[PDB]
Design a protein around this ligand. Structure first.
Ligand SMILES: *[C@@H]1O[C@H](CO)[C@@H](O[C@@H]2O[C@H](CO)[C@@H](O[C@@H]3O[C@H](CO[C@H]4O[C@H](CO)[C@@H](O)[C@H](O)[C@@H]4O)[C@@H](O)[C@H](O)[C@@H]3O)[C@H](O)[C@H]2NC(C)=O)[C@H](O)[C@H]1NC(C)=O
Ligand SMILES: *[C@@H]1O[C@H](CO)[C@@H](O[C@@H]2O[C@H](CO)[C@@H](O[C@@H]3O[C@H](CO)[C@@H](O)[C@H](O)[C@@H]3O)[C@H](O)[C@H]2NC(C)=O)[C@H](O)[C@H]1NC(C)=O
Ligand SMILES: *[C@@H]1O[C@H](CO)[C@@H](O[C@@H]2O[C@H](CO)[C@@H](O[C@@H]3O[C@H](CO)[C@@H](O)[C@H](O)[C@@H]3O)[C@H](O)[C@H]2NC(C)=O)[C@H](O)[C@H]1NC(C)=O
Ligand SMILES: [Cl-]
Ligand SMILES: [Zn+2]
Ligand SMILES: [Zn+2]
Ligand SMILES: [Zn+2]
Length: 267
């Protein structure tokens, strides 16, 4: 996601933490964000451009084979030079395992728990963005130029940001905090309140990232790439039909992030 999807995913997650998770998250954050995880959940998108964090660039996404519409960890979760685990599913495992040493303490200089928290929180968002688990040759739709209503865009960006920005504008006066409340509403009492226990039961961490990534490639095929031709204009049709899919993935990432953090920081 771009900034808004991450902010919403992290705020949903922060509001669902248990007491030990809430406290750990508070101890790990810098004072300037006043306890707000969502104010830093974009940080991995900032530092992926830094020379010292070049290793992080492949960790935001998964390249799956063109037109195959499936994910397999061994085949797909590796960077462009074949180094294993270097994808968003591998990263979620890595930082979850790192945070599980926080309770007992670590005598390793190099494990930074603030960064583990921010990477984990961000990547839990990314694995839920369907076009972050799209085809290899089009870079998850980044190479598919198009137009979104009047202005120029690309298919990846439509899912990272445009659908969210158009929904916020048309129904919430550009107000993301209120959009987020309706998402929160839709799983506390609304249409997703039925599915909640389901979202939370995905096995161990490998099992959950496999599940999340599979859901994402399947949405990328069924809803993302579906109907789209390069150079053309997408508008009310694509926007109205895809919006609810985008909203659910925001919600799902948040809910599942909270579950992970509750497990790693809890008993
Ligand atoms: C573990 O990793 C953490 C993240 O990589 C490290 O935390 C980072 O530590 C640096 C200090 O080395 C902080 O940078 C400082 O930020 C403060 C506050 O900045 C904010 O406010 C100013 C306005 O005054 C604004 O301009 C900034 O953009 C911020 O909004 C500055 O006053 C300092 O000059 C300095 O730049 C980072 O904030 C901090 N990042 C995070 C995400 O916490 C941490 O040190 C590492 N821990 C260990 C033990 O190595
Ligand atoms: C799991 O998280 C750790 C960070 O806690 C990642 O460790 C980092 O792995 C990268 C990529 O292999 C290492 O890059 C190397 O940096 C050294 C500098 O000492 C340099 O010799 C090389 O140029 C190379 O780029 C990086 O040092 C290393 N950092 C730490 C703190 O261990 C790891 O990649 C993560 N894995 C996944 C799947 O998320
Ligand atoms: C949370 O879920 C509810 C359903 O329980 C969503 O309500 C639906 O919202 C869409 C647009 O967001 C409505 O479509 C709009 O309807 C008007 C007609 O009044 C039309 O002119 C607009 O162009 C647009 O198509 C839809 O009717 C509505 N469905 C129901 C049953 O009320 C809500 O959007 C969800 N929001 C979030 C943020 O999760
Ligand atoms: Cl920083
Ligand atoms: Zn993102
Ligand atoms: Zn993206
Ligand atoms: Zn990202």
């Amino acid at each position: 996601w771009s900034k808004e999807g991450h902010v919403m995913t992290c705020r949903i997650a922060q509001g669902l933490l248990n007491d030990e998770a809430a406290h750990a998250v508070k101890m790990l954050l810098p004072e300037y964000v006043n306890g707000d995880l969502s104010a830093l959940c974009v940080w991995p998108d900032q530092v992926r451009h830094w020379y010292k964090y070049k290793w992080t660039s492949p960790l935001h996404f998964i390249d799956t084979p063109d037109k195959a519409c499936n994910f397999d960890y061994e085949r797909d979760c590796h960077d462009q030079h074949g180094v294993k685990d270097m994808c968003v599913a591998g990263a979620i495992q890595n930082f979850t395992t790192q945070l599980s040493h926080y309770r007992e303490g670590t005598s390793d200089r190099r494990y930074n728990m603030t960064e583990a928290l921010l990477f984990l929180s961000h990547f839990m968002g990314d694995i839920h963005q369907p076009m972050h688990v799209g085809f290899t040759s089009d870079a998850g739709g980044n190479s598919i130029d198009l137009r979104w209503f009047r202005h120029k865009s690309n298919l990846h960006h439509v899912w990272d940001r445009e659908i969210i920005l158009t929904a916020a504008k048309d129904y919430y006066a550009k107000d993301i905090n209120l959009l987020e409340e309706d998402i929160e509403g839709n799983f506390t009492d609304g249409i997703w309140s039925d599915d909640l226990a389901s979202w939370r039961e995905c096995g161990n961490v490998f099992s959950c990232v496999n599940k999340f990534a599979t859901e994402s490639i399947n949405i990328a095929c069924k809803w993302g790439y579906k109907g789209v031709e390069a150079g053309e204009t997408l508008s009310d049709d694509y926007f109205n039909s895809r919006l609810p899919i985008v909203m659910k993935r925001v919600a799902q990432g948040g809910i599942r992030l909270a579950m992970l953090l509750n497990n790693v920081f809890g008993a």
